[PDB]
Amino acid sequence: NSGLHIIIFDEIDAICKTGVHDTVVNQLLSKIDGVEQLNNILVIGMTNRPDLIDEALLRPGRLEVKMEIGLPDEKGRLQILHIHTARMRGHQLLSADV
Amino acid sequence: SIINPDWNFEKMGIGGLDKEFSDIFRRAFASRVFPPEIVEQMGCKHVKGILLYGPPGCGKTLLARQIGKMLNAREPKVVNGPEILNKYVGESEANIRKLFADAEEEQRRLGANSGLHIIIFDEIDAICKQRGSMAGSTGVHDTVVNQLLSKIDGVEQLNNILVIGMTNRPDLIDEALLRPGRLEVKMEIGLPDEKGRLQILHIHTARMRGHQLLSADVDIKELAVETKNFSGAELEGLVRAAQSTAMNRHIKASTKVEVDMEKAESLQVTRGDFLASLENDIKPAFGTNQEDYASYIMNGIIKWGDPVTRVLDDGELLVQQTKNSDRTPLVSVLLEGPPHSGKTALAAKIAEESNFPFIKICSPDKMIGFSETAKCQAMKKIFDDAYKSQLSCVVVDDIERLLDYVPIGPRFSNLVLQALLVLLKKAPPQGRKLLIIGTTSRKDVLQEMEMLNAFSTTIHVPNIATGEQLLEALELLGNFKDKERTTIAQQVKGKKVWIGIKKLLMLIEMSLQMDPEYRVRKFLALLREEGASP
Numbered sequence: 179n180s181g182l183h184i185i186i187f188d189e190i191d192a193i194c195k196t197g198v199h200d201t202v203v204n205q206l207l208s209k210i211d212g213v214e215q216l217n218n219i220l221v222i223g224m225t226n227r228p229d230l231i232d233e234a235l236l237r238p239g240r241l242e243v244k245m246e247i248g249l250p251d252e253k254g255r256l257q258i259l260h261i262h263t264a265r266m267r268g269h270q271l272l273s274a275d276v
Numbered sequence: 277s278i279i280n281p282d283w284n285f286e287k288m289g290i291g292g293l294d295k296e297f298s299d300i301f302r303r304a305f306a307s308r309v310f311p312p313e314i315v316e317q318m319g320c321k322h323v324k325g326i327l328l329y330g331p332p333g334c335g336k337t338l339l340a341r342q343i344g345k346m347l348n349a350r351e352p353k354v355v356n357g358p359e360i361l362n363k364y365v366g367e368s369e370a371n372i373r374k375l376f377a378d379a380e381e382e383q384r385r386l387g388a389n390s391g392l393h394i395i396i397f398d399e400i401d402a403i404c405k406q407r408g409s410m411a412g413s414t415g416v417h418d419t420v421v422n423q424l425l426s427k428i429d430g431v432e433q434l435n436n437i438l439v440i441g442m443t444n445r446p447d448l449i450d451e452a453l454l455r456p457g458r459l460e461v462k463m464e465i466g467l468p469d470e471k472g473r474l475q476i477l478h479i480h481t482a483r484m485r486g487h488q489l490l491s492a493d494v495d496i497k498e499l500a501v502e503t504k505n506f507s508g509a510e511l512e513g514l515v516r517a518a519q520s521t522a523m524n525r526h527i528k529a530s531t532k533v534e535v536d537m538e539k540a541e542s543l544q545v546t547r548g549d550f551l552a553s554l555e556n557d558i559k560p561a562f563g564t565n566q567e568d569y570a571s572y573i574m575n576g577i578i579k580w581g582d583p584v585t586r587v588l589d590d591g592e593l594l595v596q597q598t599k600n601s602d603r604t605p606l607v608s609v610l611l612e613g614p615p616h617s618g619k620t621a622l623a624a625k626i627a628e629e630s631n632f633p634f635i636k637i638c639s640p641d642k643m644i645g646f647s648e649t650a651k652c653q654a655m656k657k658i659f660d661d662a663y664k665s666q667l668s669c670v671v672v673d674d675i676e677r678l679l680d681y682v683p684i685g686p687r688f689s690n691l692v693l694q695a696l697l698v699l700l701k702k703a704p705p706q707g708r709k710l711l712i713i714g715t716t717s718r719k720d721v722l723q724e725m726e727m728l729n730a731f732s733t734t735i736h737v738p739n740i741a742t743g744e745q746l747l748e749a750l751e752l753l754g755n756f757k758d759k760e761r762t763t764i765a766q767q768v769k770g771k772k773v774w775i776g777i778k779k780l781l782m783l784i785e786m787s788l789q790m791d792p793e794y795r796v797r798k799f800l801a802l803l804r805e806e807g808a809s810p
């Protein structure tokens with residue numbers, strides 16, 4: 179009985195690909211594989227090159243589910259601009275004409 | 277001794293593979309069970325490897341680990357094929373060298389008393405100077421497979437190794453790697469039949485039975501006769517998906533309804549979850565794909581007259597001939613007709629009504645922008661997959677577009693034509709059947725390219741040729757409110773109507789875009805304008 183630890187990683191594609199890559203990837207895989215049996219592992223990672231990452235990292239039980247973030251969205255762009263300009267209006271410095 | 281003479285392979289692992297074990301152990305490893313004294317007196321050497329091939333994910337590595345353990349061997353040293361390959365010069369071979377070190381040292385200090393080391397490979401075909409024969413430029417050095425051979429059997433001899441290799445494509449394995457003294461015993465791991473699909477299911481669901489989590493509703497014989505050509509990994513995924521869906525259902529239901537704790541603890545999965553997941557979640561790879569039919573038979577099949585029944589009956593007769601006859605295990609047929617006459621839908625229906633285990637459709641919609649060699653590779657892969665089932669049915673969607681035919685010139689690709697012409701006359705391995713259905717709109721061109729001599733029969737898909745047939749089709753399609761239909765019947769009594777069904781659908785839909793006044797005249801004008809005759 180314990181809480182969940184959330185370890186964030188960025189740019190996994192760089193390491194996944196001169197013999198250092200294989201050993202590093204295997205060392206990372208060792209813990210999640212099940213030998214170290216860690217049942218408290220939330221590994222939310224980030225990357226920009228889905229084609230330069232080992233598919234073993236996404237083998238069932240490794241990464242499983244994935245998602246991508248798209249354009250800022252026209253309505254989402256409106257919402258973010260609204261948030262920033264509301265922070266601005268917090269002191270009413272912004273002119274009403276805008 | 278290393279094992280009792282009768283061995284044992286069950287209930288601890290391997291499922292439907294029991295004959296395989298006895299076969300392999302009687303053929304090859306008979307030199308490690310006989311009393312050592314007679315083995316020494318005879319003076320015989322032991323085999324130095326074996327090869328296993330078959331479909332992907334059918335239970336090969338499990339057998340390798342079991343055979344390694346049951347010989348009283350050290351821990352296996354697994355390694356993957358494509359991973360040992362580097363762009364640097366002379367570094368794809370150091371990786372191969374770095375796997376025999378410990379065995380070398382142990383043989384060095386202790387001679388003729390060491391144990392056994394198993395060096396299980398995987399995708400052994402990646403390193404081979406034979407993939408370059410197929411169109412392309414991938415030479416893979418051809419030095420890699422000269423550093424592995426020189427270590428197994430060279431000037432220096434090792435007598436404490438056993439190399440086991442696995443591959444999916446047995447036709448790209450270099451020939452220098454199968455002579456006596458090297459990998460020298462082949463073996464096949466096929467798809468699991470009924471008894472295997474029963475044993476695997478029983479094995480994979482014992483835990484949930486132990487605690488009575490499973491309800492008494494679910495059986496296993498029913499689920500062992502519905503899953504046709506499933507591979508074991510698919511069965512495991514099916515069980516996992518059933519568990520997950522039942523869990524989600526129970527949490528959602530008990531949350532929405534403030535049920536008493538009695539059913540809240542209870543997490544029975546029942547059988548509804550099993551069927552739901554089976555019919556909605558898991559999609560086999562060597563079985564029927566019931567989803568894509570809805571993308572071809574979009575508006576059902578209407579019986580506007582006589583020809584439909586004739587075509588369907590002929591298809592039934594050919595299916596029956598291919599099912600239950602010998603001396604003729606390969607059968608072909610060709611459907612042809614004028615454009616927009618509905619040739620693809622009839623082919624899909626004929627294929628679907630066969631109830632075969634393996635059904636596949638090879639259409640050009642998924643080869644946009646492909647180079648011709650890619651088309652050849654895709655066709656060959658589909659046929660190879662079709663060769664691995666007792667009964668099969670492969671459809672070719674449009675033969676005039678696969679060749680890139682264009683009336684100017686004429687021009688087309690020769691490679692695809694020759695590949696198809698060779699593939700139409702190649703019998704499958706002994707004891708297996710097949711059926712091929714073509715489709716095209718230009719019979720004369722295929723007749724001219726000497727292609728109509730390879731097919732075994734032909735069927736004609738006629739067009740709407742009389743006013744009465746058009747009237748019946750319109751009546752069954754249910755439009756024009758039956759009062760404008762009287763005027764239509766009066767107008768179309770000429771009997772000089774030559775139109776296709778798909779074009780008829782398009783024309784009706786287009787004419788239905790006006791007010792009730794001008795609709796009939798617009799439709800009649802459109803029909804008259806497009807009223808070209810043979």
Ligand SMILES: Nc1ncnc2c1ncn2[C@@H]1O[C@H](COP(=O)(O)OP(=O)(O)OP(=O)(O)O)[C@@H](O)[C@H]1O
Binds near residue numbers: 579614622778
């Ligand atoms: N009796 C029928 N036979 C065939 N198709 C029918 C019939 N009744 C309705 N249809 C509908 O007609 C359409 C069949 O058109 P299809 O795509 O097969 O045309 P095609 O002649 O193969 O086309 P193309 O030559 O351009 O490749 C589908 O919508 C099918 O639902």
Ligand SMILES: Nc1ncnc2c1ncn2[C@@H]1O[C@H](COP(=O)(O)OP(=O)(O)O)[C@@H](O)[C@H]1O
Binds near residue numbers: 333
């Ligand atoms: N005969 C079988 N009985 C039980 N499980 C099996 C069987 N064959 C395969 N499996 C399952 O498949 C997985 C192993 O697949 P594997 O045979 O290693 O694929 P590959 O041949 O590509 O290496 C295991 O999780 C195992 O549970």
Ligand SMILES: [Mg+2]
Binds near residue numbers: 619620673674
């Ligand atoms: Mg067509």
